[PDB]
Amino acid sequence: NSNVIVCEICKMAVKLIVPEADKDLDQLEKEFIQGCMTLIGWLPYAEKECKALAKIEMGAIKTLLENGSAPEEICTTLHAC
Amino acid sequence: NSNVIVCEICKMAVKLIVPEADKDLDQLEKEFIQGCMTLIGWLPYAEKECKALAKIEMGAIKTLLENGSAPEEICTTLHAC
């Protein structure tokens, strides 16, 4: 819909994932969830949003990178940023 | 936490509630939920957030008005806007 902070959430995950030689869930999630909370902790079901976005966003970002997407176009592909 | 769109959500509910001679749930909710979605429909549990915020935000706004809060300070009181 609006997307204005899903896009900041996505830009945040891209920073988390891209520089990492060893891409994997390995507690890159924890870092994602904290920065996700910081951006949406003030919602009644914030924790639940962030748990799900961690898998959805980071999974999507990782595969798009593997299949040749330019890192600065990934959030546009996903969310029209 | 961040609050940047809970504050737009609150400013939106204030517009919905304040001019209304007959303050009540009466499908002022529907209107709230649509404008809430527009602001957060792109989240995995958006509908759930909006259902809850409708009761939390509008209930809080209505009582604060009844007890003498200035309408332009209500979202500051609630969310530090």
Q: Which of A4, A7, A8, A42 to mutate to test the interface with B (most CBs of B within 10 A)?
A: A42
Q: What are the domain boundaries of chain A?
A: 1-81
Q: What is the resolution of this structure in A?
A: 2.3
- Smallest CA–CA distance, residue B77 to chain A, in Å, is 15
Write out chain B residues lying below 8 Å of A6, CB-based: 42-43
Give the tokens for residue B35: 């404008």
Task: Kindly report each contact of residues A60-64 with a partner whose C-beta sits within 8 Å and lies 24 or more positions away, as own/partner.
Answer: A61/A10, A61/A13, A61/A14, A61/A17, A61/A18, A62/A17, A62/A23
Helix (H) or strand (E) holding A38: helix A28-40
Cα–Cα distance measured from residue A14 to residue A17, given in angstroms and rounded to the nearest whole number: 5
**A80: alpha, beta or left, given left = phi > 0 and alpha = psi -120 to 50?**
left
Cα–Cα distance measured from residue B53 to residue B37, given in angstroms and rounded to the nearest whole number: 11
Cα–Cα distance measured from residue A70 to residue A74, given in angstroms and rounded to the nearest whole number: 6
To 10 degrees, the CA torsion angle through B32, B35, B36, B38?
Answer: 160
Residues 6+ apart with CB under 8 A from B48: A44, A45
| Fold that domain A1-81 belongs to in CATH | NK-Lysin (1.10.225)
Residues 6+ apart with CB under 8 A from A61: A10, A13, A14, A17, A18, A74, A78
